Amino acid sequence: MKKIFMMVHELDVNKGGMTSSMFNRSKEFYDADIPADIVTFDYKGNYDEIIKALKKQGKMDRRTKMYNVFEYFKQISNNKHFKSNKLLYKHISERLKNTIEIEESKGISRYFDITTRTYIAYIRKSKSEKVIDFFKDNKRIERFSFIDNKVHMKETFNVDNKVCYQVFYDEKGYPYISRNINANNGAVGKTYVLVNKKEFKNNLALCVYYLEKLIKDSKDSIMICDGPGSFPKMFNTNHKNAQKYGVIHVNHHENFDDTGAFKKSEKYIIENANKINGVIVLTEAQRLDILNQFDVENIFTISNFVKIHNAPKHFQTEKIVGHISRMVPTKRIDLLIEVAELVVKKDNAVKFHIYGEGSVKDKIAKMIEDKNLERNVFLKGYTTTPQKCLEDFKLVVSTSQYEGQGLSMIEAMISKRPVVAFDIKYGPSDFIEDNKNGYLIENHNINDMADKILQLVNNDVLAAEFGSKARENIIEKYSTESILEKWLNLFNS
Numbered sequence: 001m002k003k004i005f006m007m008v009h010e011l012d013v014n015k016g017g018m019t020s021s022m023f024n025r026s027k028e029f030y031d032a033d034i035p036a037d038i039v040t041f042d043y044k045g046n047y048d049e050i051i052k053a054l055k056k057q058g059k060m061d062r063r064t065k066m067y068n069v070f071e072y073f074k075q076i077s078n079n080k081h082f083k084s085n086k087l088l089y090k091h092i093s094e095r096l097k098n099t100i101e102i103e104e105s106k107g108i109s110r111y112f113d114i115t116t117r118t119y120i121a122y123i124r125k126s127k128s129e130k131v132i133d134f135f136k137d138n139k140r141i142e143r144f145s146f147i148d149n150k151v152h153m154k155e156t157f158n159v160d161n162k163v164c165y166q167v168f169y170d171e172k173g174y175p176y177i178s179r180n181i182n183a184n185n186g187a188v189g190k191t192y193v194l195v196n197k198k199e200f201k202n203n204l205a206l207c208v209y210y211l212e213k214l215i216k217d218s219k220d221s222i223m224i225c226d227g228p229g230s231f232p233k234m235f236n237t238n239h240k241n242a243q244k245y246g247v248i249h250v251n252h253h254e255n256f257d258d259t260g261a262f263k264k265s266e267k268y269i270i271e272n273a274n275k276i277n278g279v280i281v282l283t284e285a286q287r288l289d290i291l292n293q294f295d296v297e298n299i300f301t302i303s304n305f306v307k308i309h310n311a312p313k314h315f316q317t318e319k320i321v322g323h324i325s326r327m328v329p330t331k332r333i334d335l336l337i338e339v340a341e342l343v344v345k346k347d348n349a350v351k352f353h354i355y356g357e358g359s360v361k362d363k364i365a366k367m368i369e370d371k372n373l374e375r376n377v378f379l380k381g382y383t384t385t386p387q388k389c390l391e392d393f394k395l396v397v398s399t400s401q402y403e404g405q406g407l408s409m410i411e412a413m414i415s416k417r418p419v420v421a422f423d424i425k426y427g428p429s430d431f432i433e434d435n436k437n438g439y440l441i442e443n444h445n446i447n448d449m450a451d452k453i454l455q456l457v458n459n460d461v462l463a464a465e466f467g468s469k470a471r472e473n474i475i476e477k478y479s480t481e482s483i484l485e486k487w488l489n490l491f492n493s
């Protein structure tokens with residue numbers, strides 16, 4: 001009866017909390033006999049390989065389907081032919097016939113016509129990927145992109161060598177979508193779906209049509225929008241019965257802002273709460289802040305579902321401080337390096353294991369070296385097994401300035417690893433009980449945080465006691481039953 005469609009930009013293998021919560025939410029709805037699938041809107045040439053990898057890793061439940069806008073029309077297109085598009089491949093081969101090949105490296109080569117003496121093509125082969133750039137009067141006109149020698153995309157270039165047009169090709173090499181690209185901002189213009197002879201004014205129009213085709217207009221159909229920038233796709237559909245929910249995963253205020261500004265995407269979701277079935281926030285404090293600040297009522301608090309597995313059989317007695325996150329500015333890993341410097345200057349035995357990848361990773365690497373912490377702080381890369389990494393840590397640290405909730409802190413507490421976190425909006429004070437299951441540090445206070453890490457790393461009994469109470473607190477306050485009943489209460493009203 002009930003079926004759920006959870007919307008986000010894309011799915012990939014080295015992501016953070018938002019997709020992690022969608023994957024766990026899907027598992028919980030399927031266990032309660034409610035199919036809950038993921039709808040994505042990006043274009044990938046190898047989506048089938050991403051899905052298999054996420055499922056093999058155990059991140060994505062085997063029952064979770066991913067519905068993708070390009071995949072839907074590509075699959076319709078695949079059914080149209082039996083034979084591969086031999087003529088497109090013959091056309092490409094003919095344009096390279098009667099040329100001079102000039103090799104630059106392995107995989108890289110250039111082609112010059114024997115008669116016109118001019119530069120025809122550039123080919124770059126790396127692994128399973130191939131790119132063929134064609135030229136006219138020493139200017140790049142087009143690029144054909146291949147995966148396992150099969151064309152998947154053609155891009156056209158303007159005078160400034162910027163993308164002005166794209167064509168997507170199915171599994172047999174036939175075009176199924178063609179679209180204009182505004183080279184000034186990279187936005188998608190008029191899109192033509194060759195397979196059904198339908199044209200759309202832009203990508204949002206295509207995505208709105210797609211959702212109306214995918215999701216039947218029944219009260220049993222439930223749309224949950226997780227990706228904030230994706231909210232207009234769900235919001236603009238013509239559904240009269242299907243339910244619409246927006247989940248806000250972050251602090252709705254603008255990050256690194258003293259003017260009090262609100263994030264644009266989240267502001268649009270909140271302001272439109274009364275026009276949909278509900279806008280979900282992860283903590284009670286955010287719901288109250290929103291209600292005080294905005295003229296809306298449809299704000300509901302529903303925590304992320306929590307996966308309570310078995311606690312690691314042994315406590316880490318070694319001075320290992322862990323940190324598992326997306327390496328992004330809001331996590332303030334620079335403050336963690338500054339804290340590490342203080343902890344290491346009072347105790348040189350304490351190790352800091354930092355997992356993840358992101359924009360700040362290089363800045364942080366240079367920062368450890370400049371502070372000469374290369375013997376104590378280790379950038380361990382992304383982990384597909386955070387639960388196993390958690391066993392190696394004595395405690396976990398959070399210098400993050402903004403959260404919606406904080407699954408890594410919650411995950412550490414489930415593995416009996418106490419958290420030392422800056423008391424920020426939102427999340428830490430909901431689950432950390434200061435001096436009972438961890439420590440809540442006054443925001444920016446790097447000295448008091450360094451002091452609490454030192455007390456904790458050098459006290460085996462306190463570290464074990466805090467961790468034990470931490471798992472107990474999560475089990476008690478984040479039951480799957482109460483969270484599922486909160487969602488069911490909305491779906492049934």
Ligand SMILES: CO[C@H]1O[C@H](COS(=O)(=O)O)[C@@H](O[C@@H]2O[C@@H](C(=O)O)[C@@H](O[C@H]3O[C@H](COS(=O)(=O)O)[C@@H](O[C@@H]4O[C@H](C(=O)O)[C@@H](O[C@H]5O[C@H](COS(=O)(=O)O)[C@@H](O)[C@H](O)[C@H]5NS(=O)(=O)O)[C@H](O)[C@H]4O)[C@H](OS(=O)(=O)O)[C@H]3NS(=O)(=O)O)[C@H](O)[C@H]2OS(=O)(=O)O)[C@H](O)[C@H]1NS(=O)(=O)O
Nearest residue numbers: 009015016017018019041042185187202203204227229230
């Ligand atoms: C006239 O042009 C002007 O308006 C149009 C829209 O109006 S129109 O309909 O009249 O044409 C604007 O075009 C639209 O918006 C563009 C844009 O916002 O850039 C663009 O949207 C697409 O691309 C965005 C960027 O993609 S990215 O892959 O390069 O980042 C994308 O938004 C991004 O979403 C990701 C995400 O959710 O994955 C965000 O990343 C964040 O979350 C990740 C996942 O979380 S997790 O925890 O790991 O699981 C994290 O990994 C990541 O660290 C984190 N980044 S962080 O900074 O928050 O820490 C990322 O920040 C976003 O940028 C869009 O996805 S969406 O869900 O937001 O919709 C995506 N839309 S899609 O292609 O349809 O999927 C498009 O060109 C267009 O989108 S639209 O929906 O088709 O309308 C146009 O820009 C504007 N030009 S302007 O006026 O000059 O500014």
Ligand SMILES: O=c1ccn([C@@H]2O[C@H](COP(=O)(O)OP(=O)(O)O)[C@@H](O)[C@H]2O)c(=O)[nH]1
Nearest residue numbers: 016017018020325356382383386406407408
């Ligand atoms: O190397 C890494 C880094 C992050 N994560 C996961 O990404 C999520 C991060 O969640 P959180 O809410 O703490 O922060 P967010 O990424 O949403 O900003 C957690 O479930 C982590 O286990 C992971 O699996 N491996």
Ligand SMILES: CC(=O)N[C@H]1[C@@H](OC[C@@H](O)CO)O[C@H](CO)[C@@H](O)[C@@H]1O
Nearest residue numbers: 017018021249250403404405406407
């Ligand atoms: C930094 C931040 O606010 N992250 C939140 C969010 O992640 C997604 C964020 O990338 C979207 O831009 O979602 C997680 C799961 O709900 C929260 O636990 C987490 O706090």
